[PDB]
Amino acid sequence: DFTKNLLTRIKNLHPLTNKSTIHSLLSYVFSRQTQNIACEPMYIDYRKDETEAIIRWKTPLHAETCINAFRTQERKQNSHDDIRAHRKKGSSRPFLIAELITGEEEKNYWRMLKK
Numbered sequence: 001d002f003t004k005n006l007l008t009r010i011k012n013l014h015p016l017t018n019k020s021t022i023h024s025l026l027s028y029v030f031s032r033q034t035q036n037i038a039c040e041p042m043y044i045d046y047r048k049d050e051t052e053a054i055i056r057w058k059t060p061l062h063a064e065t066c067i068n069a070f071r072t073q074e075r076k077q078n079s080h081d082d083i084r085a086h087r088k089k090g091s092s093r094p095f096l097i098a099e100l101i102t103g104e105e106e107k108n109y110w111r112m113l114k115k
Helices: 019-033 059-073 103-113
Strands: 006-011 041-045 052-057 097-100
Touching: 006 059, 019 041, 019 052, 019 059, 052 059, 059 097
Parallel strands: none
Antiparallel strands: 006 052, 006 097, 041 052
């Protein structure tokens, strides 16, 4: 038993970032996507020196807003502590991507959390 559609994978984070910066970046981007709901990334699963994180959002609406935000906004983290993540001309950094985790990978997230 779990609430479906809460989880978003964020890809192409700066490898030397941290959970606090990810939280601020997500909130900054979320606020440009909507002012109707607040940014509530309840848990951020992130390991230092990785370029991906899994976000457990408070509700499915939050997760959907996150997906829409990164699809419509070009963002690239320029340093480990960059929150606003403006793409720079000529930068070799890739664009931040957010994907909803579904299917067996979603089931396994909750199974491993409860292990």
